[PDB]
Scaffold this active site. Structure first.
Site, PDB file in Angstrom:
ATOM      1  N   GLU A  35     -46.055  99.644  53.326  1.00 15.50           N
ATOM      2  CA  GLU A  35     -46.127  98.389  53.827  1.00 15.50           C
ATOM      3  C   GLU A  35     -46.648  98.367  55.369  1.00 15.50           C
ATOM      4  OE1 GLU A  35     -46.588  95.848  52.257  1.00 15.50           O
ATOM      5  OE2 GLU A  35     -45.424  96.124  50.363  1.00 15.50           O
ATOM      6  N   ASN A  46     -53.542  87.239  54.994  1.00 14.05           N
ATOM      7  CA  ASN A  46     -54.232  87.366  53.680  1.00 14.05           C
ATOM      8  C   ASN A  46     -55.041  86.231  53.115  1.00 14.05           C
ATOM      9  OD1 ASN A  46     -52.030  89.165  52.639  1.00 14.05           O
ATOM     10  ND2 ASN A  46     -50.665  87.598  53.126  1.00 14.05           N
ATOM     11  N   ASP A  48     -55.520  83.754  51.464  1.00 11.06           N
ATOM     12  CA  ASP A  48     -55.098  82.547  51.152  1.00 11.06           C
ATOM     13  C   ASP A  48     -54.495  81.944  52.707  1.00 11.06           C
ATOM     14  OD1 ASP A  48     -52.462  83.585  51.770  1.00 11.06           O
ATOM     15  OD2 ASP A  48     -51.643  83.065  49.691  1.00 11.06           O
ATOM     16  N   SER A  50     -52.030  82.834  54.523  1.00  5.05           N
ATOM     17  CA  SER A  50     -50.741  83.434  54.794  1.00  5.05           C
ATOM     18  C   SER A  50     -50.753  84.546  55.570  1.00  5.05           C
ATOM     19  CB  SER A  50     -49.873  83.420  53.555  1.00  5.05           C
ATOM     20  OG  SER A  50     -50.205  84.579  52.719  1.00  5.05           O
ATOM     21  N   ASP A  52     -48.363  88.299  56.429  1.00  4.94           N
ATOM     22  CA  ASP A  52     -47.212  89.147  56.177  1.00  4.94           C
ATOM     23  C   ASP A  52     -46.924  89.891  57.511  1.00  4.94           C
ATOM     24  OD1 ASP A  52     -47.777  88.923  53.594  1.00  4.94           O
ATOM     25  OD2 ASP A  52     -49.150  90.645  53.470  1.00  4.94           O
ATOM     26  N   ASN A  59     -43.813  87.940  53.658  1.00  4.97           N
ATOM     27  CA  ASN A  59     -45.102  86.936  53.610  1.00  4.97           C
ATOM     28  C   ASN A  59     -44.452  85.254  53.869  1.00  4.97           C
ATOM     29  OD1 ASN A  59     -46.883  84.892  51.754  1.00  4.97           O
ATOM     30  ND2 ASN A  59     -47.951  86.633  52.583  1.00  4.97           N
ATOM     31  N   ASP A 101     -34.336  87.752  44.205  1.00 10.05           N
ATOM     32  CA  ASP A 101     -35.272  86.676  43.532  1.00 10.05           C
ATOM     33  C   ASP A 101     -35.446  87.712  42.347  1.00 10.05           C
ATOM     34  OD1 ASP A 101     -37.051  84.915  42.483  1.00 10.05           O
ATOM     35  OD2 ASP A 101     -37.804  84.574  44.371  1.00 10.05           O
TER      36      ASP A 101
END
Ligand code: NA
Length: 129
Positions: A35, A46, A48, A50, A52, A59, A101
């Site tokens: 990462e 990103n 979109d 967003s 990281d 994110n 999650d």
């Protein structure tokens, strides 16, 4: 901060990641390697809009606030900047929420594509732990 491999393994273990939600220490070290290349100050924007952040590239769409990801959430209740610290506390505590999650470590695309199914114990081989 750019961690050494064993340096990070030891810190992650001190911060309670070894076997967290059943994921051995090497899984977390592998994920951080791919990462962020072990750099707490890593960021990546990103498509979109967003971003990281940090050693585990967490994110802003769901997990932290940066004030510039419209419609997003802050489920770790932290500024995204906290994820860039030399002190891995915020990144670790947020990663614990994320892996809890439903999809486990598959939340980290680099883990799924580069660590999952591999000999992840090699990432902690030789380290004092
Ligand atoms: Na957010």
């Amino acid at each position: 901060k750019v961690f050494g491999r064993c340096e990070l393994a030891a810190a992650m273990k001190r911060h309670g990641l070894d076997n967290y939600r059943g994921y051995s220490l090497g899984n977390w070290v592998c994920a951080a390697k791919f990462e962020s290349n072990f750099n707490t100050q890593a960021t990546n924007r990103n498509t979109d809009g967003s971003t990281d952040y940090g050693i585990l590239q967490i994110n802003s769409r769901w997990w932290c606030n940066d004030g510039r990801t419209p419609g997003s959430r802050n489920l770790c209740n932290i500024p995204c900047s906290a994820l860039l610290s030399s002190d891995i506390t915020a990144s670790v505590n947020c990663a614990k929420k994320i892996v809890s999650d439903g999809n486990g470590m598959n939340a980290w695309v680099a883990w799924r594509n580069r660590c999952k199914g591999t000999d992840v114990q090699a990432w902690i081989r030789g380290c004092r732990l």
